[PDB]
RNA sequence: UUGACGGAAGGGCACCACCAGGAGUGGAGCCUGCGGCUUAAUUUGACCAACACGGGGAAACUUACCAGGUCCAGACAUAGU
RNA sequence: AUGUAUUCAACGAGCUUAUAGCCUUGGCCGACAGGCCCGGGUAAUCUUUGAAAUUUCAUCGUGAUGGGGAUAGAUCAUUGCAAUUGUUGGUCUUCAACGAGGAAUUCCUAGUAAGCGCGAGUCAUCAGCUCGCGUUGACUACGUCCCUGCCCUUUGUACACACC
RNA sequence: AGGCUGAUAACCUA
């Protein structure tokens, strides 16, 4: 439909390398793919991902408080 | 609290009491209406204009944010 | 030796003083740290009104 | 024959700034040369605001530091060697006289 | 089921010159190579593969320790072993197809993780 | 005797006091500073009048901290090889 | 709130010209981010023909909803010698608490409070900070010593490190 | 745990 690549969710997939709009599970999916893939290679964002810290550069001494 | 159930398109039973209840309403807004036929704004906003259509409702003051219209003839 | 870029950032500029490398006021070219400043304010030309 | 000739001032002081102004144009009214000026250009009011104290500890108070610099501008219509004789005149400290034949 | 990066499987990323494997990465490392590579990067590259020349058949390289962990893992460093400053030690790594496009900083914790004691004096009351 | 102090008195005063109020803050998410914890190190000063303060918004430098490698940028004078 | 239409500031700051290091108009390319080219300005001369809230019309309709935008995935560009422990800026997607806040407590008397944005400092890149600037523009009081303190007098004192 | 106090006790809140 003429719809261009930079309006998708899914730009350059990492396996396939094409363009689409990944929704419901298929959405979860590639999510659960992206975690699994950093953790498997020991991937410094992976492991905080593991460890259920921020993974996007924030200070982590104030916020965050939930546990 | 409850929450209010508006409906969005209007019945056979509420279209007709717009027609000929509403009418008769000095103060006629898309609040009253939604209240009082416990429809949405956005229903009472396309309804106001329908009745305007029909001539049963004259304006009084037009505003993007406040519409205030009344009944065409007096009692 | 002294081999890492000085192009930019607070090591390439020092005070024209005192040389240290804090507070550096670079408004209008004047390159002095603000305690120096505030010591040669008057002799620069600078005065207080309000 | 005759040109615009323009004449730039600038100083912190404006009592001296005023009385070179007044000495060029009553200099070159005595040779009953038209005279444009002197026009004053707004006041460039330099502004520094620093910390007063040396370190961090206390209530912060600021310093407000203000370096005025006045502008003036006077045009001269007649030779540039008649404007020479008039500007070569000893002027007064701290008062910087620029001139310049203006392009038109 | 084997290892493709962008939809070019593996032994094709081997074969590929550099300015194909750019448009392949993200736009990080493609910026990275295209405002061009210094010289400490090139020589790591030049020991990483001298390595594997010198590994008997059938057995990993020997270990090269770097500084560099700003720089980017291509298809060329996968089966290295490459030992990664962390600014104390030398954390061992075997490159794998996945960490094709990371630095290799990514892989060398410079943090101990935090495992919390009790709280000391001074902690509440605040 | 002078001061300071008083749940002593008298007079006067202040939105860093109150009154009449407005906006709030304190609750949420987040930003940033401080403590604590952790760490090879998480450099450090400061506790109304410390805590978006040291103009302190640190990727390198800054940088004082930690793990390592260099360099002499040891004048001058005396003796020695 | 969103999407249109509409429309009014002030303080200020700006370059080594090297192809060009600062502020950048105009033209072209691009959805954006950004890029290319011709230039202006060492400045009441050029950027500067220079804001937002607000005004206006429409959509939404009391539903954590088109309120809120944290957290997170993918990808693109820019600064830099270097961006990972995301520098920042874009695009699509993800769409948490929070429904007005307990004890307690801050500031403020008129172009003030509050709201609204702008410049400057820091600065290669980075503002939720600070210092200034204007725009919109109130409520209440014109008192008192009740609380927290301060000044003067008289008075008591076994205090003088001075009621901690 | 927070608040109140220069600080502790007392007191108040969660
Ligand atoms: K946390
Ligand atoms: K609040
Ligand atoms: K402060
Ligand atoms: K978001
Ligand atoms: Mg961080
Ligand atoms: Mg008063
Ligand atoms: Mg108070
Ligand atoms: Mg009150
Ligand atoms: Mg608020
Ligand atoms: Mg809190
Ligand atoms: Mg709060
Ligand atoms: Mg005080
Ligand atoms: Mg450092
Ligand atoms: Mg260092
Ligand atoms: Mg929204
Ligand atoms: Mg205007
Ligand atoms: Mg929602
Ligand atoms: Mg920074
Ligand atoms: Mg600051
Ligand atoms: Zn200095």
């Given at each position: 439909?003429?719809?261009?690549?930079?309006?998708?969710?899914?730009?350059?997939?990492?396996?396939?390398?094409?363009?689409?709009?990944?929704?419901?599970?298929?959405?979860?999916?590639?999510?659960?793919?992206?975690?699994?893939?950093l953790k498997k290679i020991r991937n410094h964002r992976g492991l905080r991902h593991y460890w259920g810290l921020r993974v996007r550069g924030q200070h982590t001494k104030t916020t965050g408080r939930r546990g | 609290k409850e929450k209010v159930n508006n409906m969005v398109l209007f019945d056979k039973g509420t279209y007709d009491k717009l027609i000929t209840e509403a009418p008769?309403?000095?103060?006629?807004?898309?609040?009253?209406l939604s209240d009082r036929l416990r429809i949405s704004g956005s229903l009472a906003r396309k309804a106001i204009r329908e009745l305007m259509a029909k001539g049963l409702i004259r304006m009084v003051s037009a505003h993007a944010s406040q519409q205030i219209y009344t009944?065409?003839?007096?009692? | 030796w002294n081999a890492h870029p000085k192009n930019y950032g607070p090591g390439s500029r020092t005070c024209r003083v005192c040389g240290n490398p804090h507070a550096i006021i670079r408004k209008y070219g004047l390159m002095c740290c603000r305690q120096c400043f505030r010591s040669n304010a008057k002799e620069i030309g600078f005065i207080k009104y309000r | 024959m005759i040109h615009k000739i323009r004449i730039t001032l600038?100083?912190?002081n404006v009592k001296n700034l005023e009385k070179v102004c007044a000495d060029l144009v009553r200099g070159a009214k005595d040779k009953r040369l038209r005279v444009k000026g002197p026009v004053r250009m707004p006041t460039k009011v330099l502004n520094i605001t620093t910390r007063k104290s040396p370190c961090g500890e206390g209530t912060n108070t600021w310093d407000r530091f203000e370096l005025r610099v006045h502008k003036r501008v006077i045009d001269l219509f007649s030779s540039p060697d008649?404007?020479?004789?008039?500007?070569?005149?000893?002027?007064?400290?701290?008062?910087?006289?620029?001139?310049?034949?203006a392009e038109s | 089921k084997k290892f493709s990066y962008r939809g070019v499987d593996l032994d094709s990323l081997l074969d590929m010159s550099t300015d194909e494997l750019v448009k392949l990465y993200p736009a990080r490392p493609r910026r990275r190579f295209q405002?061009?590579?210094?010289?400490?990067?090139?020589?790591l590259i030049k020991k990483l593969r001298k390595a594997k020349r010198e590994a008997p058949q059938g057995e990993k390289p020997e270990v090269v320790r770097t500084h560099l962990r700003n720089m980017i893992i291509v298809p060329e460093m996968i089966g290295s072993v490459i030992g990664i400053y962390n600014g104390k030690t030398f954390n061992q790594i075997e490159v794998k197809p996945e960490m094709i496009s990371h630095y290799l900083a990514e892989f060398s914790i410079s943090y101990k993780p935090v495992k919390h004691g009790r709280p000391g004096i001074g902690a509440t009351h605040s």
């Open positions: 439909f003429k719809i261009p690549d930079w309006f998708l969710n899914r730009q350059k997939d990492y396996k396939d390398g094409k363009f689409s709009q990944v929704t419901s599970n298929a959405l979860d999916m590639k999510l659960r793919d992206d975690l699994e893939r | 008769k309403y000095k103060l006629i807004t898309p609040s009253v009944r065409a003839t007096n009692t | - | 600038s100083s912190k008649v404007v020479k004789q008039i500007t070569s005149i000893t002027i007064e400290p701290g008062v910087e006289v620029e001139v310049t034949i | 405002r061009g590579l210094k010289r400490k990067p090139m020589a």
